Amino acid sequence: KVFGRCELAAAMKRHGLDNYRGYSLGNWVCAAKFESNFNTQATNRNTDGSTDYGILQINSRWWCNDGRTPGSRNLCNIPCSALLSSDITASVNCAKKIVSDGNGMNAWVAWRNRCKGTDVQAWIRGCRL
């Protein structure tokens, strides 16, 4: 599913990503935009034989398992395909653990390069929340 910008923001709000670990909702919307372009089915492989999954591009080296990646630990205790669903609950839950893992949102490359330090408030404009 391809989300609308405020549509995704509403869902993220409900699951409480707004201001989670000190990151305002706009950060999380911006992250999703530049990681997956609001597409829950987005998948991208990188050169360590692993794939980033879903709306927030969670990597299978540590967080989820595809049976495809070496030395995978699956710290979110969930198949990587659960992060592909139209329902973002699986991704948000796992994301909360990731952002708490001693790096904040720096775990997400696209966020660090295209969202961090910017007026993230813009990503929730026009939204009724």
Distance CA 24, CA 6 (A): 14
Q: Which is nearer to Cl ion, 6 or 78 (CB)?
A: 6
In the complex, residue closest to Pt ion by CB: 15
Does residue 11 interact with Pt ion by CB under 5 A?
no
Cβ(30)–Cβ(123) under 8 Å?
Answer: yes
**Among residues 6, 11, 78, 109, the one that binds Pt ion under rule CB under 5 A:** 6
Query: In Å, how far from its chain's centre is CA 120?
Result: 16
**Among residues 1, 2, 5, 6, the one that binds Cl ion under rule CB under 5 A:** 6
Query: Given the rule CB under 5 A, which residues bind Pt ion?
Result: 6, 15
